[PDB]
């Protein structure tokens, strides 16, 4: 048998256990998102710590990030999204970057994953 390393092994939610993602894989989900008529958006933050409170159920700290510009309404091509990512990477090179999606009919997000690490 082997032992799972417990020391310095952080994880970042969805698609963090599969092998690293490539640019082809990246520009494959953006298309799946567009085929279902959803709205993309970008977010950035320099840390990922989680904090709790003494006796308040359902309260956690560290869930909100910072929005890049504004949600890309009326977007029908993927290319545009990839350019905006390079702009964000150039702007702040010491932060995490995330990609989101949105459904206005049920009022809820649909996917999220990381594309850059410090």
């Amino acid at each position: 048998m082997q032992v799972w390393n417990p020391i310095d092994n952080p994880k970042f939610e969805t698609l963090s256990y599969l092998p690293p993602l490539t640019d082809n894989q990246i520009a494959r989900e953006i298309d799946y998102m567009l085929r279902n008529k959803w709205i993309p958006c970008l977010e950035f933050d320099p840390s990922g710590t989680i904090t709790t409170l003494p006796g308040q159920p359902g309260y956690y700290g560290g869930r909100y990030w910072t929005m890049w510009k504004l949600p890309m309404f009326g977007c029908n091509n993927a290319g545009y999204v990839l350019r905006e990512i390079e702009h964000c990477k150039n702007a702040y090179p010491g932060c995490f970057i995330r990609v989101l999606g949105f459904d206005n009919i049920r009022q809820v997000q649909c996917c999220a994953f990381i594309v850059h690490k410090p």
């Binding site: 048998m1 799972w4 599969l18 989680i50 159920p57």
Partner: protein, 452 residues
């Protein structure tokens, strides 16, 4: 002739029901439907007792159909006035509709199939405490189904040992853990120590990976005071979720708890125990599609819906029909799945379905097809039975799900091409390989007793 009005124009504030009946030889059908309606509402066809205005307090039959394929089977429709029921009480409704019609000696069998609740009666209930969207926003998890596991063996383990397993299981990659339904307070382990050890394990596991974790704490008791005492401690410690059995406990106790959970911001998980005593035979009892509606009205966040490839009975079509009646908002009528009436929920939150009962890695592709990414999957023996341990077992379960999610999104089939998705993923994962070798040829196939 009287309790049978073959023209009555059903109103929009009435409650409708549909029974299937098996009359004795000789008894004409249009005579039995009238008897069922009378013996359910008042118990008479004459006016010898009235003249005291009545009529405005009686149910009437308004349609009859023959069942195709069977020579002795019929469907009867009955309508009830609105003023017969008390607002905000499921106990009353159940007592008034079903509480004397199942002993009638002129019949041989009876089964309730569906019910239609008007919006003028649904608005007097509270409903689920939080719903679907609010829970996802609270937990900060999007884009994939959630995972969980139950602890075994049931009955026999201490509190320190119980907590040592939760940590190793939770540290591996799962999201939730659960106590068996028959674990309340026993001589070998009392509840107040189990709570503390579980809390310590949860904190230690959360500090490591960097994601939010939880565990369902059982709150069933023998008296209401004890049941309410066992929830204030969970509120004090800061735990996010609790569990309750609603069929052996009661509807009165479930409603009191739902109110408390809404007041103090907790999440409620429900277990369906003893239900198989009522809905397994196809000619006597009450279908589950009715109990599911009743629970959605009473209050809850999760509910067990069963698998289709496990160790317990369950048919695809029927399931696909009641999972929408539980998740959706407006549902049309389709008899190819078991919907007899149209339903409108006038903006009432939904309920997450759960699947569990003898399942392993060679079942992910199907489960992911039948249910979308709006469910929870549980694996008890599939995790604690891995040749290595609990952490190695949990990692193998998460990798399979991630591979399945990526495949579908890339636009590939899952029914046709599923074994490949698993075989290709096992190449780079040393933990997934071991599990696949242990449970290769283990399936469950028998004849269905509740066909349709």
């Amino acid at each position: 002739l009287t309790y049978y009005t073959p023209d009555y124009e059903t109103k929009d504030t009435d409650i409708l029901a549909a029974f299937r009946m098996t009359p004795q030889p000789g008894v004409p059908p249009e005579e039995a439907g009238a008897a069922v309606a009378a013996e359910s509402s008042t118990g008479t066809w004459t006016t010898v007792w009235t003249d005291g205005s009545l009529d405005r307090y009686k149910g009437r039959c308004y349609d009859i159909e023959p069942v195709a394929g069977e020579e002795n089977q019929y469907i009867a429709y009955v309508a009830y006035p609105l003023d017969l029921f008390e607002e905000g009480s499921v106990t009353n409704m159940f007592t008034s509709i079903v509480g004397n019609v199942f002993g009638f000696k002129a019949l041989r069998a009876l089964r309730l199939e569906d019910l239609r609740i008007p919006p003028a009666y649904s608005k007097t209930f509270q409903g689920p405490p939080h719903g679907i969207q609010v829970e996802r926003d609270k937990l900060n998890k999007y884009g994939r189904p959630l995972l969980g596991c139950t602890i075994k063996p049931k009955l026999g383990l201490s509190a320190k040992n119980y907590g040592r397993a939760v940590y190793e299981c939770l540290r591996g990659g799962l999201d939730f853990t659960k106590d068996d339904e028959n674990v309340n307070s026993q001589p070998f382990m009392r509840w107040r120590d189990r709570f503390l050890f579980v809390a310590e394990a949860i904190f230690k596991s959360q500090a490591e990976t960097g994601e939010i974790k939880g565990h369902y704490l059982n709150a069933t008791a023998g008296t209401c005071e004890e049941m309410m005492k066992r929830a204030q401690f969970a509120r004090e410690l800061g735990m996010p979720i609790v569990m309750h059995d609603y069929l052996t406990g009661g509807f009165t106790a479930n409603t009191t708890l739902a109110h408390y959970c809404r007041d103090n911001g907790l999440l409620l998980h429900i277990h369906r125990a003893m239900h198989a005593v009522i809905d397994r035979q196809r000619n006597h009892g009450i279908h589950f599609r009715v109990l599911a509606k009743a629970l959605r009205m009473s209050g809850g966040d999760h509910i067990h819906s069963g698998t289709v490839v496990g160790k317990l009975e369950g048919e695809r079509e029927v399931t696909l029909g009641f999972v929408d009646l539980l998740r959706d908002d407006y549902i049309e009528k389709d008899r190819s799945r078991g919907i007899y009436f149209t339903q409108d929920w006038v903006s009432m939150p939904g309920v997450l379905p759960v699947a569990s009962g003898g399942i392993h890695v060679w079942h992910m592709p199907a489960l992911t097809e039948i249910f979308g990414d709006d469910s929870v999957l549980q694996f008890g023996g599939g995790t604690l039975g891995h040749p290595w341990g609990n952490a190695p077992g949990a990692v193998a379960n998460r990798v399979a799900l991630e591979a399945c999610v990526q495949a579908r999104n890339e636009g590939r089939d899952l029914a046709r091409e599923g074994n490949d998705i698993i075989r290709e993923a096992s190449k780079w994962s040393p933990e997934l390989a071991a599990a696949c070798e242990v449970w290769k040829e283990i399936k469950f196939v028998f004849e269905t007793i509740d066909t349709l």
